[PDB]
């Protein structure tokens, strides 16, 4: 129905600068990632390089914001690349270097921003462009951030206001931008969703003229908001910052649990980045420093298994650089891609004791079952060829190891760790 | 397995006597209603027979229940049909004869029921079959429903709950009863959904053998269960009570909204009881006594073509036998059913100034548009073709007149009164 | 003090509950046995409530821990009665008066707890009220339990004979001849909140009966927001849900009082609930224990006794009484202590600062009461200043617990207190007193 | 008993707020002219305060509706001044010394109008904190606004300068001579409750700024739940978001009255709001009205100061006073009626039954007095009996607004009374 979908007939792949870098990643840090991208990730379908939140702030440094301070802004009220921390941006060029360079490696480039207006323009009441009312004429007076201070909200009912958001997907369309992660947009915790400015931005992309990507943050997202988001996003977070925590990682699946039914080509719920190899080098949210994820790597193939199967968008959070031959194989088995790429139908099939079994299709005649234990303890994980809605017996193979394990008769039942999981392809018996 | 979506594969349609007959019908007014059925409405897909709250309750005589009486039950903590208002379930027979004489006139026997087990059976501690435990062993001591006094809930961590359930549907099964509308259970002012009790009676509904088609209520339904009621329930009420009044029908917009994405085979988000026709006779909700159907034929029209595209279930809720040929003609209309039967993907396609239009298709090609003037103001309500994701040119057929419109180039466009609506079908232009 | 029913609790009321001792499950024996000692080593001091605490009317309860849905003990009029089985005595539908009886010839007084409402065996029955030809079902809310426990309906003040119903209770329990009246879900619910009319209709009906009950309302946390009712209405009510014997619950209830401390007055006193002193559990398993002394270390009985004297709150001994040993009898018995609660007036948190906390009132007769307390998990120094006091010159002080002179102090009032351990102070004057 | 600032209002106060008159947007000349009105006509019968209301440091404000985001007039140390063009005296930084000095002149005492926090301009520029070596961006909240006005963001009382910055504006105001403050977005917010901590600073700066300045709290409602603290740091707080001339909002306060009523006492009053009075919504939008004389009929005007009168609310006009008519000055010029402001004591809702409600209150000679209202749609006789007031003999009547005797009453009080239409008699010992 919605010309965007076409966009995204599969969840977007990529990396972002967030968990490695906070607001602070630099231009060479960013291609070194493109181009690791390239050559080790990209004919496996990883193709988005999406520089986080703050790359208009000089002095970011960390997760944790500056409060109040000055960023680099246009004479059109619109934020601009630090040119400290990106050097091709020098002479009003902004990311069209960068994005070209990226492009040039055959991939994709997106950028995150912040919900609304600078309030250093709504201060200062610069213009907009396309219009002779001022910045100070289209912010909400009661619309902020609660967890930072750039920006005021833009308000829909006033003249200006569409005019602002159509002249921001220019700026991004001239730059070759492909890609948007909003924030401060699904949820907040003074506001709720900002609905109205989704609406401003999917019609300020559809005006832009190129085909931006459209992703929503933070979570948690409301399920009361599922059309909204279904036709207008390509993909919304359904939860608060994910981290390297057992903790959030077993939460994810009651979300999953939650949305599955939104899930669709164009339209992807989104269980937020992957916080895999070498994260918090300037960030010390998630309870961490500069670090190796603490996930084990039971938990790490768990996460990988429920993305995958779930068919969330999949956004590294490492640096990529630093990949070991481990962190590498999870983004590589392209007999589990397949799942997310060509499976669909992804449902839980139960959940009892902590334990947990999803079972999604492809339309070769495949079934994918994910068995998970997320309890404390070692125990045996069973489904039976019924509740999958198997009538015959079928060939079974575990697709992270790439490995047959013959004809399963009645069940399907494997001793799992505690955290840890199994992902099985079953397929007609020969 | 969802098996149980193939009992309702397009939205379940019949009657029921909670608009006409409160918690009171007599199986005489029972029968009425179904020879009227059979013999006007069974070709158009009309076949539910559904008798609504309180049939075991002797002396109710309104929409406004009795407090704290006695109920007719049996010796296993039952509720059974009050025999001075149903005489064929003399001697312990219960709903079967009335059942097989619906199923006779080859319609569909539906009932009512209140979540939980009845208050009398837990105060006295009657009996479950197939256990030792009692009533009494199995009930919740903290829930009730707000509106009605019949019920305590049950507990389904307690030893005996699922036999309890499941004994329910074994005589509903032995009635022959093949829909069962079960209240108290979606929202709730004390508790909100009682999620528990939805999956006990799925597991009841599954054990018993028949096919029950599982309608869920009362409204309004939280979009946070939107996982649970598609895989659990053939239909769960968008609402609270639903009634004559214009207020109410403009609300039903934003809720077909809101729950669009989650329509489909199986699985029907319920717009309520039709209150057409003859209703309040003993009934005083709505703020009604006994009227013919306060909706104008222009709001009745609205109200009937948004459930229609939608795919609402279609209850209908007045006395059929005092139906005009008016009130017969909003039923038997094929080319307006077949977009209940056969559309899907219905959508709004915008909402601006109370002017709403929604568009669904068939597999055929065929493109079902409804332009709605939900405003207090006569108007033009118009659609572009585009935004319908037409390309070119297309002929019109107005649905309900059965009337050619001749070829549109552009856009669909029609004066529409305030309240008033049109259902077109455009195909292509020779 | 414009309402009358205020002159019966001029004082805040002080005695022994059954609860947090017996649980629902207390026996005419282990309550005369209370009594009993109440006479004997309490009644000089202000101790004389006798309350027999919730479900006296189930005679097969044996804990905390209630049975739901089953038989209670009722008359002819809806109204229940004392299990025959644990009260021997109300044997031939005597009720509570031979008790009562028994309790006012040691010199004390007698209580009862009450459920809110009226059975709903009766209103299933469609059983009669005294007084009116409508049922017992006739007058009962169609929505109106109580979440924790199965034996009531609520009372629908709008409905003909909801009144006549409540007049009858107090009938009942003027008749028996009790005291004071502990009415449970009635003050807050996790389903309705504070039940305003039905606290009306109880107001009404006990000064109808024509004898002085004190009206004693839970459970808590009491809402801000309907103070003045409670203010007109009540006796006492609780500040809090359930207390017992855990730092967390006592900590907790330094901000309750500070919260509730200008509504407290002559008549009307807002309830830091019973005092889980002494032995406890015996046949109850709240507060996460079981059979045992209070597990309240010394400092902590004393930060607890301390905080409730100088704030007026109702004091209500909760543990067997007979099972005291020397130490939980001496926090009963010091009048010196005692004075602060009966005849102090005006309490005030002075400051709250780094979980160090101090309270001030003061008597008549210009002495000054301060009760300085140490809520962290630390050792330190806590003080205050004369001047935040409000006192101009210097004074004597005196150690209240220890009955111990201090000697004068000329600015400041310090102490080096433990975690959770506090002090009582009482300051004089100094300037126009002999050596 | 306890705190010295009690004594600074042991009568609620009473005075003019320029708010329900002129909006944002008062000027100088119109606060003289009020005051002048007020040294003549009323100070004799107890009203005091001149009190200048919100934003007079907006000096392009020119409505009840602020004009957002726009910069302020402010000193170097981050503290919000008289906007020069509205107030021409406090040209060469002299702020409102000169105003204040003319308004004691006529013994008259001079109140103004803040916002909690400091200014956003001030956060912007990292303008000084007076005293210190901290700039305003290192006191400010993060996460605290005001969610109808734009001017300020909330000071975090953990920052070191933030008591620095609330005692330097202290220390300005008293310089002024200011005598009270009104302190608005502290009471209830939408988006954050009660600023219970910056009340606190408030109360502090005060007390350290050397002078007597009365401390009002706004907007309502005020949540019950902070009662212990609004008594012991406020001489008064707002019960209501903003009252105006609408009968739903005076049938509204009753209710608001008898919540708070255990907690009136000498120095610490809660707030039923300014009285729209007179002749307001001169340069005000707000209420849903515009220029205009009160929509109050004058049974709801007796009816409201009857109200406020019993309970002890503070008395603060809000209309333009020059345009006072002859009954509308009799409304402020009752002696008799307000000496049970003055000096009544106890006030308590004896009954509210069928929208009809008395309330008594008494004196320390042993006047009683009660107010009785029938708060209803109909005509109706209201009642009560000498027996429900505590009285328990014969009692001698006056009606007080009429200043008219009733004569010797028995057994009840009782009038027939029209919609919104009430009464006030004392009760005195009969011979």
């Given at each position: 129905?919605?010309?965007?979908?076409?966009w995204?007939?599969?969840?977007?792949?990529?990396?972002?600068?967030?968990?490695?870098?906070?607001?602070?990643?630099?231009?060479?840090?960013?291609?070194?990632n493109?181009?690791?991208?390239?050559?080790?990730?990209?004919?496996?379908?990883?193709?988005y390089?999406?520089?986080?939140?703050?790359?208009?702030?000089?002095?970011?440094?960390?997760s944790?914001?500056?409060p109040?301070?000055p960023?680099?802004m246009?004479?059109?009220?619109?934020?601009?690349?630090?040119?400290?921390?990106?050097?091709s941006?020098?002479?009003?060029?902004?990311?069209?270097?960068?994005?070209?360079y990226?492009?040039?490696?055959?991939?994709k480039?997106?950028?995150?921003?912040?919900?609304?207006?600078?309030?250093?323009?709504?201060?200062?009441?610069?213009p907009?462009?396309?219009?002779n009312v001022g910045?100070?004429?289209?912010?909400?007076?009661?619309?902020?951030?609660?967890?930072?201070?750039?920006?005021?909200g833009?308000?829909?009912?006033?003249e200006?206001?569409?005019?602002?958001?159509?002249?921001?997907?220019?700026?991004?369309?001239?730059w070759?931008?492909?890609?948007?992660?909003?924030?401060?947009?699904?949820?907040?915790?003074?506001?709720?969703?900002?609905?109205?400015?989704?609406?401003?931005?999917?019609?300020?992309?559809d005006?832009?003229?190129?085909?931006?990507?459209?992703?929503?943050?933070?979570?948690?997202?409301?399920?009361?908001?599922?059309?909204?988001f279904?036709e207008?996003?390509?993909?919304?977070?359904?939860?608060?910052?994910?981290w390297?925590?057992?903790e959030?990682?077993?939460?994810?699946?009651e979300?999953?649990?939650?949305?599955?039914?939104?899930?669709?080509?164009?339209?992807?719920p989104?269980?937020?980045?992957l916080?895999?190899?070498?994260?918090g080098?300037?960030?010390?949210?998630?309870?961490?420093?500069?670090?190796?994820?603490?996930f084990?790597?039971?938990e790490?193939?768990?996460?990988?298994?429920?993305?995958?199967?779930?068919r969330?968008?999949?956004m590294?959070?490492?640096e990529?650089?630093?990949?070991?031959?481990?962190?590498?194989?999870?983004?590589?088995?392209?007999?589990?891609?397949?799942?997310?790429?060509?499976?669909?139908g992804?449902?839980?099939?139960?959940?009892?004791?902590?334990?947990?079994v999803?079972?999604?299709?492809?339309?070769?005649?495949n079934q994918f079952?994910?068995?998970?234990n997320?309890?404390?303890?070692?125990?045996?994980?069973s489904?039976?060829?019924?509740?999958?809605?198997?009538?015959?017996?079928?060939?079974?193979?575990?697709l992270?190891?790439?490995?047959?394990?013959?004809?399963?008769?009645?069940?399907?039942?494997?001793?799992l760790?505690?955290?840890?999981?199994?992902?099985?392809?079953?397929?007609?018996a020969?």
């Amino acid at each position: 129905s919605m010309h965007h979908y076409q966009w995204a007939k599969t969840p977007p792949m990529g990396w972002n600068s967030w968990d490695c870098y906070g607001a602070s990643v630099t231009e060479d840090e960013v291609k070194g990632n493109a181009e690791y991208m390239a050559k080790y990730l990209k004919p496996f379908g990883w193709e988005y390089v999406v520089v986080d939140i703050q790359w208009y702030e000089p002095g970011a440094n960390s997760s944790i914001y500056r409060p109040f301070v000055p960023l680099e802004m246009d004479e059109y009220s619109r934020l601009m690349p630090a040119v400290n921390r990106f050097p091709s941006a020098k002479g009003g060029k902004g990311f069209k270097p960068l994005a070209d360079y990226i492009h040039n490696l055959g991939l994709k480039f997106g950028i995150h921003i912040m919900r609304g207006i600078p309030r250093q323009a709504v201060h200062q009441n610069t213009p907009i462009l396309g219009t002779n009312v001022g910045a100070r004429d289209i912010a909400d007076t009661n619309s902020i951030c609660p967890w930072n201070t750039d920006m005021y909200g833009v308000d829909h009912r006033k003249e200006g206001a569409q005019a602002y958001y159509d002249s921001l997907f220019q700026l991004y369309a001239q730059w070759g931008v492909d890609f948007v992660k909003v924030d401060d947009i699904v949820a907040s915790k003074l506001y709720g969703t900002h609905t109205e400015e989704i609406k401003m931005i999917r019609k300020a992309i559809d005006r832009c003229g190129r085909p931006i990507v459209l992703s929503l943050s933070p979570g948690p997202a409301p399920l009361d908001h599922a059309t909204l988001f279904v036709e207008n996003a390509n993909m919304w977070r359904m939860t608060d910052d994910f981290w390297d925590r057992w903790e959030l990682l077993y939460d994810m699946f009651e979300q999953c649990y939650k949305w599955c039914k939104l899930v669709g080509l164009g339209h992807w719920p989104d269980a937020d980045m992957l916080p895999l190899g070498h994260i918090g080098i300037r960030s010390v949210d998630g309870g961490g420093t500069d670090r190796m994820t603490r996930f084990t790597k039971d938990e790490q193939r768990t996460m990988m298994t429920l993305w995958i199967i779930f068919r969330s968008p999949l956004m590294f959070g490492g640096e990529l650089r630093d990949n070991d031959e481990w962190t590498l194989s999870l983004l590589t088995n392209e007999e589990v891609l397949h799942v997310h790429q060509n499976g669909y139908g992804a449902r839980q099939v139960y959940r009892e004791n902590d334990h947990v079994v999803w079972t999604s299709q492809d339309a070769e005649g495949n079934q994918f079952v994910a068995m998970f234990n997320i309890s404390e303890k070692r125990s045996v994980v069973s489904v039976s060829l019924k509740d999958l809605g198997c009538m015959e017996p079928m060939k079974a193979r575990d697709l992270w190891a790439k490995e047959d394990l013959g004809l399963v008769k009645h069940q399907l039942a494997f001793e799992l760790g505690p955290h840890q999981s199994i992902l099985v392809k079953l397929s007609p018996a020969v």
